[PDB]
Subunit: 260 residues, 4 copies
């Protein structure tokens, strides 16, 4: 702690995709740093188990991030549990691969739409509602009322063959950062975006080991899969450092994804 | 010019073609000796355009976000002119709505709609055009087609109230590379233009002092862009084979302020 | 006909660096053939004379070290004396060396880094400042325009490979100047643009997604032409690269 | 702290422009986190006073960062004092404003050249020499042998009227980050760049207070000058977070500089 350093203790985090991978690690980091967390996930089993393991500072609320009504209910539950919302972290996402021209014809419109719905619409939906709650907070240190962190992907910059939908959704997340920051600046709410490279996600851990090790060796340095706790450490830094706003930060070991 | 790609006789498919940018692209294309199939949701405007352009033009009513309308539009282009060489996606809406507004949070429905038309619509026509283009015989330099999408400077310098618009156009911009990478195998190039402030129908609706003020925000030329200038760039992209997988800002050096 | 805001290339005076070969030669050729005047600038007299000779009465040559204050001024004076004005500057002069930060003999030489910067970046800025000064004396033309400056960066500004610290630094510097320079020179009606070429000629093409070949210099020249003709292009860097994204190795 | 977290304690920092502003704050942060610092600056009085105030964990070496011979002397002095170099932070920089076409004629070539010399050639010079020293270190945690952090500027993206030289130099720094990171990955040396917005620098503190306050009010949130300690906090997070590599981070309160 030095003068403009923002304290993490006792701040209330709302976190999506919190039952696994990135979101799980953020929830763990937050609780261990002395914060409150409300876990949101569409999977009840995983979410209940996480909140259970983290203890009294955690709650879980089943949530389809793309739903208006679920989004509200998630806000209401966070307020009822902990009285306020200080930080939103959007980690819910899917990363499918589908060619524009595949063996069985054109990319399905439905699958494109669905990727957009979960990754981009879902992010916007939680963002708009969290923001509305955060704006009711009393202005804190430096006039700050909240911090919103979204998750894009290096696919927003280096999209591979088969990632039209994924790149479109994550590019959309990245490009919203600024206009949203610009508005929410009036209320003291910062808006930031992290663009991860290759991390040990559930999809990743599903692959055979030789394939996992090969992805890792594609990353210049460190030549390994990123650890979810490293994504969480960056989230922490964004909460603590008040000068970080309206920016997209690549967390990717210098990776630039080839076409194949 | 040896590797210069010829515009004459190529078949353009163009969305939002009943007005503004798409209208100017249609005009440019017909006057350079090409065929155009105009697509628009507004039948009156589209028919009138095709009528005015003459025998080299057809119109097909189309909701670009619809799977079935998209297919019908491809089928109509093939039936009329036998092939598709160029797709230009100009259909788009540019609404403003705050995240935290007078009536509460930004409506989810309005966000979703802006994404549907601007992004899902662009992807829909792209996927179906590409499929048709791949059936063409390889032409000059092995090229079978060119796809040109329209993003916006909002993809980079989004203003207060443009979350939806920036999201949709940022999505368009970010697709360019993964799509270009795949479609390279078929000789189909994929490019994106990011316009600044142009004399669109919404723009021409505004009172003159407001128009003039928007123009004076542009460093040089300090005016609204002319739709024919956007069309001139589209032409150059069709002609210049080295242009691929790139987003081009057409904006007089504008960098939009927050408000 | 041609649209109202279309900018005509006929009779405009081009000043072109690195004009004795490659990209600059092809720009000089395009310009003369479209009815413009060209002043060719190059450090190599043999190549420059031969080019100007082959292009004819609409071309002149002036030997020039683009990084030199006094050579830069002499080049402006020679253009004015020959053709009375300057309407377009195209900076194509450049070197593209590869040298590792940590090499077999030791660290990257400071002298070689400095020299790459001097030719690619300082040289570009030098010709830009002096051309701009001359262009500002022109009467305002169509749409109030007095000139166009076009600089050459490289995809190395974005996807720099192992060994390209110097090259990437110099071309990144060119790319980043585009905006602050365009912002100022907007007052005088001078547009400022930058082209970032991929791999151009001088299986080597098979790394390029499409077209899977080396770029032709005349294609770079076609883009220059389009920039001069399209008045809404300003303050932007355009990648001309067949969708290439250079790997590290 | 998590298993892949990189410890700052006992690492040796070499820092340029360390007598004032950003480099002084990085030195302070590093010493107070338990690290060693070698301060480099052209100004002896400021540098000695800094090293004096920081104590036994600090040394000062007078240095023109653009000089080959001074650069080498600096490396030798750091090795002789602390045996190794683990982190280089390049903060030495000048930020002049000069129009391309000014009231009294064209931008001087000498001034452009000088800004490039100090900001870009100087940064490259220290980098190449620090990298050479770092490569001799034994591979540490995660195989890492060093971290190099350069300072660009938001001028690399949003250059204002009068900033051709400054933008050119800082855009050059930014664009080197990837090709350097790609090579030095082989030796386990990470390379990162920070792009600061408006900070309380000595040039800034030289201005009258109304002009300061006005610059601060141009920043969306927080609407103030950035504190050098915040730039130092981000440096620290880069040294700690191993997945950060080959990237430029904007630290700017969502500022997008207007032309004027």
């Amino acid at each position: 702690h030095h003068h403009h350093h923002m304290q993490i203790e006792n701040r209330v985090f709302l976190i999506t995709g919190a039952g696994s991978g990135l979101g799980a690690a953020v929830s763990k980091m937050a609780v261990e740093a002395g914060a409150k967390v409300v876990l949101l996930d569409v999977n009840a089993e995983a979410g209940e188990a996480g909140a259970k393991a983290l203890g009294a500072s955690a709650r879980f609320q089943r949530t389809d991030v793309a739903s208006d009504t679920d989004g509200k209910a998630a806000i209401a539950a966070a307020i009822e549990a902990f009285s306020r919302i200080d930080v939103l972290v959007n980690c819910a996402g899917v990363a499918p691969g589908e060619k524009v021209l595949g063996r069985e014809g054109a990319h399905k419109l439905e699958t494109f739409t669905r990727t957009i719905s979960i990754n981009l619409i879902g992010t916007f939906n939680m963002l708009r509602l969290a923001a509305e709650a955060m704006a009711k907070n009393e202005p804190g240190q430096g006039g700050e009322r909240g911090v919103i962190i979204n998750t894009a992907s290096v696919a927003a910059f280096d999209g591979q063959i088969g990632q039209a939908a994924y790149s479109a959704s994550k590019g959309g997340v990245a490009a919203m950062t600024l206009p949203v920051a610009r508005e929410l600046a009036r209320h003291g709410i910062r808006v930031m975006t992290i663009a991860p490279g290759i991390f040990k996600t559930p999809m990743m851990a599903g692959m055979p080991q030789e394939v996992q090790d090969a992805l890792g060796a594609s990353v210049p340095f460190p030549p390994r899969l990123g650890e979810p706790a490293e994504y969480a450490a960056l989230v922490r830094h964004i909460v603590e450092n008040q000068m970080l706003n309206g920016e997209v930060i690549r967390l990717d070991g210098a990776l630039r994804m080839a076409a194949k």
